[PDB]
Amino acid sequence: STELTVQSERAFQKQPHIFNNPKVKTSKRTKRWYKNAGLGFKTPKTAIEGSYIDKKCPFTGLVSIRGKILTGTVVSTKMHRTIVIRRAYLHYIPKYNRYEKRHKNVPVHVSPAFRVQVGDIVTVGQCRPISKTVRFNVVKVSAAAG
């Protein structure tokens, strides 16, 4: 569950059209923009005080949350900024009248204002597809048993 420095790659990670004016004495140490996610969900305090960028985040970021809202547990965490959900559910069969246990996987974009690991029932909404698998951004988290 690792993090990084301020700037790492060959660009300078900032947000678009946010201009920390060097001439005026910035009493505050940044101009950190964010938004409210809606659907009753709360921006974490870590997001506002934080120092990541992640343009794909619903918080301090440029994508938006709409479409389906879902939950699920976390089975993989070994990517960079993405986890892998397992929406466990039951499938009916008409003929046998009996359920059958089934699952999918739906990898979502873990933002670095959210500390997740294996366990961690999360809640996560749809956010204008990010890469080939990931269409979902995590918005709320919770632990597993303790």
Binding site: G38, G40, I69
Partner: protein, 260 residues
């Protein structure tokens, strides 16, 4: 498949046009226009299935080309014109004024009105938005955009708009306890009140409808359409008054009225 359909066969048009299955393959396929092709009705099926003033498309074309049919006041020679909701199709020849309002069953029927009330159509607004030079504007559901509104208007408010002025007259602010005309689904064409209103923020908010005769139902909100004050609707209403009798008492009314 490379571009826009211009044909549309029978067994694919809406059912509120009530077209017979036979005497063609095709169904008169609205042009682009003010009203959607699920919620509108072309002038040709209006004139030849619902008013019987012609028997042939040859005939309907000549009828429209004689410049009498002033659908919302303007002469229309286009057979494929999508006449839709709250439309004020008037004449000069028979001096009649038809307003496209529904049935209790969900069918654009005939509603013959006077010259008074043939001079205003209603409209639900569906987005109100700000444009060039700081000018606000308001949409309707025929696509009549209107600049310089009353700022008291919000979304889902209805407006009485005349024919030719535009010039937004008496609107109705939307809230609880108002007469509306539900125009979709199975609640299409029934009239009730705004007994309760609910917001499911994010998807498809709803409104409880109580009619006069104690029948609660609960509709979606793109099917709502305010027709006005409590017992005071701004236009006239058909037979049934949008009440949707049960089928057994419907048969009972038909049988009792059958004969003297």
């Amino acid at each position: 498949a490379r571009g826009p359909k211009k044909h549309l066969k029978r067994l694919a048009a809406p059912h509120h046009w009530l077209l017979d299955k036979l005497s063609g393959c095709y169904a008169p396929r609205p042009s682009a226009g003010p009203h959607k092709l699920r919620e509108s009705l072309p002038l040709i099926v209006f004139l030849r299935n619902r008013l019987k003033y012609a028997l042939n498309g040859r005939e309907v074309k000549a009828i429209l080309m004689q410049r009498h049919v002033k659908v919302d006041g303007k002469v229309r020679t286009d057979t494929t014109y999508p006449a839709g909701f709250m439309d004020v199709i008037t004449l000069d020849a028979t001096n009649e004024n038809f307003r496209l309002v529904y049935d209790v069953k969900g069918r654009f029927a005939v509603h013959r009105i006077t010259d008074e009330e043939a001079s205003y159509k209603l409209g639900k607004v569906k987005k109100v938005q700000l444009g060039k030079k700081g000018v606000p504007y308001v949409v309707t559901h025929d696509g009549r955009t209107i600049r310089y509104p009353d700022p008291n208007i919000k979304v889902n408010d209805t407006v009485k708009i005349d024919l030719a002025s535009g010039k937004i007259t008496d609107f109705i602010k939307f809230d609880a306890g108002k007469l509306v005309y539900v125009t979709g689904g199975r609640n299409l064409g029934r009239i009730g009140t705004i007994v309760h209103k609910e917001r499911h923020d994010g998807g498809f908010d709803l409104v409880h409808i109580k009619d006069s005769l104690d029948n609660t139902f609960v509709t979606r909100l793109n099917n709502v359409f305010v027709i006005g004050e409590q017992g005071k609707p701004y236009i006239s209403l058909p037979k049934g008054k949008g009440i949707k009798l049960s089928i057994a008492e419907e048969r009972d009314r038909r049988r009792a009225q059958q004969g003297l």
